[PDB]
Amino acid sequence: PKQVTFAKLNDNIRENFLRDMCKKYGEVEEVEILYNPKTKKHLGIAKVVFATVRGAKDAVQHLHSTSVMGNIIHVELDTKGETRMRFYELLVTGRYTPQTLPV
């Protein structure tokens, strides 16, 4: 369980921002913001894979439900990205918006 899913990220948070915020908790191996692949709209969700279990755990512990860039973000362990997959489906089809995603 080294993979973490972020949700309700402000659309001014891209890879450099999220990498910087996650490196405080441990080495970071992959960071990816998800977009609508046609319109390029930021969907507020992201994948981060940490080098260690401890990095992912500490990042979730200290970032979940914190105020970042003016709203409360959602951060959770997502071992195979299945939770983020459901988030993606709902967001990229416009069933919800990035800030109204049920979490």
Curated annotation (Swiss-Prot):
Q: What is this protein called?
A: Histone-lysine N-methyltransferase SETD1B
Organism expressing this protein natively: Homo sapiens (Human)
- Identify its protein family: Belongs to the class V-like SAM-binding methyltransferase superfamily.
Subunit info here reads: Component of the SET1B/COMPASS complex composed of the catalytic subunit SETD1B, WDR5, WDR82, RBBP5, ASH2L/ASH2, CXXC1/CFP1, HCFC1, DPY30 homotrimer and BOD1. Forms a core complex with the evolutionary conserved subcomplex WRAD composed of WDR5, RBBP5, ASH2L/ASH2 and DPY30 subunits; WRAD differentially stimulates the methyltransferase activity. Interacts with HCFC1 and ASH2L/ASH2. Interacts (via N-terminal region) with WDR82. Interacts (via the RRM domain) with hyperphosphorylated C-terminal domain (CTD) of RNA polymerase II large subunit (POLR2A) only in the presence of WDR82.
Gene designation per UniProt = SETD1B
Q: Complete protein: which residues are present?
A: 102 to 204 of 1966
Function of the protein: Histone methyltransferase that catalyzes methyl group transfer from S-adenosyl-L-methionine to the epsilon-amino group of 'Lys-4' of histone H3 (H3K4) via a non-processive mechanism. Part of chromatin remodeling machinery, forms H3K4me1, H3K4me2 and H3K4me3 methylation marks at active chromatin sites where transcription and DNA repair take place. Plays an essential role in regulating the transcriptional programming of multipotent hematopoietic progenitor cells and lymphoid lineage specification during hematopoiesis.
Q: Which domain of life is it from?
A: Eukaryota
Where does it live in the cell? Nucleus; Nucleus speckle; Chromosome; Cytoplasm
Disease listed for this protein: Intellectual developmental disorder with seizures and language delay: An autosomal dominant neurodevelopmental disorder characterized by mild to profound intellectual development impairment, speech and language delay, and seizures. Autism and anxiety are common features. Facial dysmorphism, tapering fingers, and pigmentary skin changes may also be observed.
Start and end of every RRM domain? 1-80
